[PDB]
Structure 1
């Protein structure tokens, strides 16, 4: 049992303090993002169990910039620190270079901040955007592994949504094709009903190259198609 130091190794060639946070990201709310040939669509839950909440102050899909949206999981208090850092460097990039930052260049900097050697950030993201070369979707971890995903899922119920996307993802799916697909995986792993308040989808179209949060009115026309 080696747990005192933060940078200690293992006789089997493995880290220890990083691996503790690997299980911490499996306790947050579930989320799922699909990268289609026309854009990127995200989805998440809204654990607003106590009705006294404002329901708008708590959000799971913040924005890195106007062209890059992302999800959150794990420690919500630490997830905001990385998002605030991403909102600086991505905006700082626009001040230096006139073009929008590339996700491959943005996820690599969002992962280097999880290399503080404090403590590693126990948070996994689902950064997606349509920066250049079409739309891309990335999924980072506290260990620093940045793997570009076509359709992934993070949260407490990310295991069930993993095999569902493998049996449902098709390369020739449009926005409205995946929009129903982004909800059928949420209908499976859900301890409630897919109402017009628990789901908070948003997408980034390739045409306008900007993200637009799907409000309560627009999601009602998509949750009632019954996949």
Structure 2
């Protein structure tokens, strides 16, 4: 093995520290984001320890701006650094220019913090917003390779949650068919019961273009359907 170096090439032609960092995003809490023709829904999964952890004091859907919401996974201690850096470079873009930052011009800069030429970041984000050109949902990796996902999922249970989205996705879906899909997949890959304090989803519609965290009162409006 050649893991002693921070950035050394393998005989088969691949990195090692970046490859080892990819094995750190499959240990945190799961998450799932679904994109539609008029918005984006990001369903997270709260994995609180006990009644001592105050609810709303810990969350997994941090906001980058007023029009861009994102999830996280991996080393949560290092996830509040890229998001804190994305909260600066996005507002710095809103000061030089005046329009909302495009996701493609935001995900490409948040992936630019994976430069090691310090140790690489073991964070796997799920940035999704409605910046321009319709709503988009992206998914970055510790390797810096970004892809535009239509319905992705990160976290511990992202292996069973990925193919489950391929068995229920429809291109012409609505918010009622998205919010149901964003929660019917979380009930399958789960170790607890989907109560009113186990999901902290948020949606960014295309009409108002602003994000809106779903409180515990409106979360009962979707979990009562259960198809």
Q: Which of the five TM-score ranges fits, normalised by the shorter chain? A: over 0.9
Q: Residues 60-106 of structure 1, C-alpha deviation per residue, up to 9 Å, x if partnerless? A: 00000000000000000100000000000000000001100100000
Deviation at residue 190 of structure 1 after TM alignment:
0.5
Aligned with 1:77: secondary structure? coil
CA distance in 2, matches of 1:151, 1:76: 22
Q: Residues 138-161 of structure 1, C-alpha deviation per residue, up to 9 Å, x if partnerless? A: 000000000000000000000111
Deviation at residue 220 of structure 1 after TM alignment:
0.8
Deviation at residue 116 of structure 1 after TM alignment:
3.0
Extract unaligned runs of 5+ from structure 1: none
Q: Residues 117-151 of structure 1, C-alpha deviation per residue, up to 9 Å, x if partnerless? A: 21100000000000000000000000000000000
Q: Residues 151-179 of structure 1, C-alpha deviation per residue, up to 9 Å, x if partnerless? A: 00000000111011001110000111110
Deviation at residue 42 of structure 1 after TM alignment:
0.5
- Worse-superposed segment, 49-58 or 152-161: 49-58
CA distance in 2, matches of 1:217, 1:46: 16
Aligned with 1:138: secondary structure? strand
Deviation at residue 49 of structure 1 after TM alignment:
2.4
Match of 1:51 in 2: 51
- Structure 1 runs, 4 residues or longer, greater than 4 Å off: none
Q: Does 1:192 align with 2:189?
A: no
Aligned with 1:9: secondary structure? coil
Q: For 1:1-227, what aligned pairs fall within 5 Å after superposition?
A: 1-227=1-227
CA distance in 2, matches of 1:34, 1:123: 20
Deviation at residue 115 of structure 1 after TM alignment:
1.6
CA distance in 1, matches of 2:181, 2:115: 35
CA distance in 2, matches of 1:19, 1:142: 9
CA RMSD, 1 decimal: 0.6
CA distance in 1, matches of 2:224, 2:76: 30
Deviation at residue 51 of structure 1 after TM alignment:
1.2
Give aligned pairs, total: 227
Aligned with 1:55: secondary structure? coil
Extract unaligned runs of 5+ from structure 2: none
Please, what TM-score do these two structures have when normalized by structure 2?
0.99
